[PDB]
Design a protein around this nucleic acid. Sequence first.
DNA 1: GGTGCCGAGGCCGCTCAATTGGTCGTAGACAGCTCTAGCACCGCTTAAACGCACGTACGCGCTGTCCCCCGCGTTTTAACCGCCAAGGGGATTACTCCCTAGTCTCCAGGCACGTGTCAGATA
DNA 2: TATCTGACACGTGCCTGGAGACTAGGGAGTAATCCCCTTGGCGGTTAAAACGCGGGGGACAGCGCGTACGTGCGTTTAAGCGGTGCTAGAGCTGTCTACGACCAATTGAGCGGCCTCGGCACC
Lengths: 97, 97, 79, 79, 21, 21, 94, 95, 97, 97
Amino acid sequence: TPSELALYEIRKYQRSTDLLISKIPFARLVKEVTDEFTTKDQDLRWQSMAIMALQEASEAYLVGLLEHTNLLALHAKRITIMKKDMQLARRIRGQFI
Amino acid sequence: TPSELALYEIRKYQRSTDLLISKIPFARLVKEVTDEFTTKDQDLRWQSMAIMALQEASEAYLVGLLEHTNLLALHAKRITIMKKDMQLARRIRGQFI
Amino acid sequence: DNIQGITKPAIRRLARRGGVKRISGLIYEEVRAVLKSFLESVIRDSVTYTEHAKRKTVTSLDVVYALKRQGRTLYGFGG
Amino acid sequence: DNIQGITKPAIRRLARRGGVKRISGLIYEEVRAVLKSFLESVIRDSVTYTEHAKRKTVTSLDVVYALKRQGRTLYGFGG
Amino acid sequence: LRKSTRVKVAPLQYWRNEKIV
Amino acid sequence: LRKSTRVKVAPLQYWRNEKIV
Amino acid sequence: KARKETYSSYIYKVLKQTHPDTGISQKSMSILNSFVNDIFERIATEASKLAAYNKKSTISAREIQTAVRLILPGELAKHAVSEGTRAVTKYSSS
Amino acid sequence: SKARKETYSSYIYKVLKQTHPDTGISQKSMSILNSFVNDIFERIATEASKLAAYNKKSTISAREIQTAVRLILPGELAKHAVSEGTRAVTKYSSS
Amino acid sequence: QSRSAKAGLTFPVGRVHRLLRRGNYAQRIGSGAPVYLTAVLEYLAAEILELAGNAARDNKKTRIIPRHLQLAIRNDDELNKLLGNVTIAQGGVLPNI
Amino acid sequence: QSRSAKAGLTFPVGRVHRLLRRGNYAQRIGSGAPVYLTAVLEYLAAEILELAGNAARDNKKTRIIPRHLQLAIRNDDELNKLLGNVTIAQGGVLPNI
DNA sequence: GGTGCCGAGGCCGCTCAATTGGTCGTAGACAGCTCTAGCACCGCTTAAACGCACGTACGCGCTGTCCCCCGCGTTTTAACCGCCAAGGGGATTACTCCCTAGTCTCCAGGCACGTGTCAGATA
DNA sequence: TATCTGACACGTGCCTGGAGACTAGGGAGTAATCCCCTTGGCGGTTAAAACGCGGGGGACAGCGCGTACGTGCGTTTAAGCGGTGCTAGAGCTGTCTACGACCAATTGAGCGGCCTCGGCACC
C-alpha cells in the first residue's frame, strides 16, 4: 500500500533532525546570489558557519510554509497540494509586505 | 435582487470611513473588562480619546480578520463564510502565540 | 451581559465593509470572542502602563504605547 | 542553471517532513521561487552589514544579525 | 535538589478558544 | 516648483511572483 | 501651562512649497508628526545598534546612511542617500 | 595575545549540577542557552530603558525592571519571576 | 545664521541634534549625522505631502483629510511596504474589484 | 565578598551591573535593578534547564542535545508564547501525533 | 570481545575587573494648591434593533469519467573524503593627529493668545 | 438667495532655546606583520539523482434536494442631545536628604592551555 509507505517515511523524516539538501549546490547558489548583489570590481568571500546558518534558516522557513500549505490543502477536502494553496498561504501570511 | 443589494451595500460601506460600532455599549464593555483586571477596592477611569482610539483599532483588526475569512471562504469555492474559515485564518496568522 | 452590546447589524455592516456577501449564523460568536480577547490583551497592557506611573486615569498615550508594543502602530492620537 | 540544485527529491523530503501525503507537479517551481526570494533578501541584508564594516568576508555574525533584524531570530550560531 | 512549583499544561490552541478551567 | 523624481508603480502581488519588469 | 514643540510649521512650509493652494487639518498634521517621529526613532535606534555592533562610540554620517539603506526600500533609499550626500557637501562648503 | 570571551558557561554548568547531578550538556546546547539568556537580558534592558524614558526620568530602579518583566513574560511566569526578584532584593537589602 | 539655512533645508538641524543627543543613543555624536537625518526626513515629508496633495486634488477638494493620506499610502508599493503594520485613524479601507 | 553570595544567587551581579552601566540604556542605574535582573535570569535558566533535563531523561539519555531543548520548549505553552519567533538549530519539528 | 576515536570534565597558572573607602553634585518624594473632565441624573424623541412569516438558492451527497503522480526497473553524473598548495586577509600592536563635550556669553524664533473670514448648513 | 456657524489662517510678546568662541583629552585613522582559512584541482566510489512505463486511487464535472438565509412589516427599547450638579484627580511649584558617579589600591575571581577518562563503533 502506498499510504503505508507514505506514513512510514513521514514518521521517519519527522523523527530525524538533519538537513535534506546538499551543501555544494546550495553554496554555489548563495555564491551566485551574493555575486549578483556585488559589483564586478570586488568579490566577497564566505565562511563555513554562515552558510550553515543560512541553510538552516531556509529549511526552517520552507518546512513552515509547507506545513501551512498542507493545512490549507487539507481544508479544501483534498490531500494533493496545489500552487493556489501556497499562493493564498503566502498572501495571508502577511510577510514580505 | 439580493446580489444587487449586496453589491450596493458593499460599495456604500467601502466608500464610507466613519465609525461602525456604538459608543456607549463599547464603553460599557471595556469598563466591564477593565473592572476584573484590577483589584476591588480601587478602580480606574477612562478618557474619550483612549476609548475612541481603542475602538478604531479594534474595528480595523476585525475588518482585516473578516477580509481574511472572506478570502478563505472564497478559496473553498463558496460564498457563505463559516466559523471554520475564521478559525483557520486565525491559526495561519500565527498571532497571540 | 455587556458582550451582547455588539448587535448583529453592526457585525453585518463590518462584514459588508470587509467584502462578505453572505454570513452564516455562527460568525457572530467567534467575532465576539476574538474581540473580547483582543480587548482583554490591550486593556491589560494599558492598565499595566497606567499602574506603573501610580496614576488613576488611563490616557490615550498608554493605549498608543500598548498598541505599538504589540506590533500595531496607531497614528493620529499621539507619539 | 544554478537553481537546479534543489531537485525534487529534496523538496519531497522536505514535504514529507512537513507532513504532506501527495505533491503536485507545479509545487517545485514555486518552492524554488520563494527560496530564491528569501535568499535574495537575506543576502542583500548580510552584504549591506558586511560592507558597512569595510570587510570582504561574510561571517556568521552578520547573518544572524540580519536574521534578527528581519524578525527571525536564530539560536546556536553565537551572537 | 531543587524542583519547579509552577503549573504546567499542554499547549493550547488559541484559534479554538479553549478554557483553562 | 518641487516635483517627484523616483518612479512610481502599483502595488505588486508578491504571492503570485510578480516582477517589476 | 507648559508648551510643547511639534513639526507643524516646517510641514506646513513644505506643503506650501509643494502645493501653493492646499489646506490641511489637525488629524492629518498629527498623523504626519507621528509618522516622522516614528521614522526618526527607527533610524536613530538602527544607527545606535549599528555603532554598538562594531564596538564604536560615535554616530557619523556613514552609520546614518547605512541605517537609511537598511530601513528604506530600494528607490526610496537610493534617493534618500543622494539627498543626504548633497546636503552634506552643501553644508561642508565653508 | 588571545582575548578572553565573556560567556555564561560556568554558571549554567553550576545550576545544571545543582538541578541534575548526573545529566551532562553538550556545546551546541550551551551556545543555545547562552544566546537565549543574552536575548532575554537585551529585551528586558531595552524595555526597561524605554519605559523609564517614557516617564521623563533618568534613573532605572527595581520598579522599572519589575514592570518590564511583568510586561514581557506571561502572567504565569511573571508571577514567580517577580516573587523570586522580590525575595532576592530583600535578601540583599537585609544584610 | 541658522544651520538649516546653511545646508538649504527647511526642517531644523539643532532641534533634531539635541533630540538625538539626549536620547541615550551613543556616548558621542558626529557632525554630519543631524544634517543627513534632517535631509532624509525632509525628503520623506515632501514626498508624502506631494502624494497627499495629488490625491486631494484628484477629488476636486481644497483640504487634505486622512482618507486622502490612506489612499496615497495604499496606492504606493514602497509606502505600503514601509507602513505595512501601521493603521491610519479615520482612513478606512480602499475599494477593490 | 561578592554580591552574588550575599544575594544567595548563582549568576554574576557585577557583570550585569557593568553591562547595564555601559549599555547605553540610561544615565543612572539603580542598585536593586542588577540583582533583580540576575535573579530573573537565573530563574528562567533554571526552569528551561530543568525542562531540558527532564526531556533528556525521558529518552534514557545522559547528554543534552538541541532536540531535547526543542522538545522541552515546544511542549510548554508559556515558553512557546515567549519563544514563538526564534528557531533552534538542528532542533527538528514536533511529530503530528 | 579487544581497541582506537573523540568529546566531556578536572587541574595550573595567570591577568584584568569587581570591592572598599571617601567625596560632592543632584533629583524626585513629599506636601501644597488650583482648575477640569469624568461621573451620575434627568426629559424626551426619533433612528435603529427585534420578532414573525416565507420564497428561495446553493452547499452537500451521490454518481460517473478521466488521468497523472507513484513505484519498479535500468543507467548515470556529480557529492564527498583525503590530499595537495598558494595567498588574500582578519586579528593584533604602535603612533601621531584632531572632534567634540564642556563652559560661558549673547540673541533671534516659534508657541500661546487675539482677530478675522469664507465654505457650508439652515431657512 | 439671505443669514448663522465653525475651523483655518494671519498678527503680537518674549523667554527659553539656539548660536558663537577657547580648551584639552581620549578616540578613530594610518602602517606593519603573521598565521587561520579559503579557493581551486585531482583520484576514486558508490550513494543518489535521471529517465521510461504500467495502472490505479484521486481530482473534477453534473444532478437532486431541502434546510438555512435574506426580504418585508408591526413594534419596543435603548442610543444621544443637552442640561444640571458634584468632585476626585490631573497638573504646576517649593524643600532637601538620601542615592549615585568618580578616583586610588588591590586581591580573589574567571578563562586559556594541559591531561585524563569513559562511551561507542570497529574488526
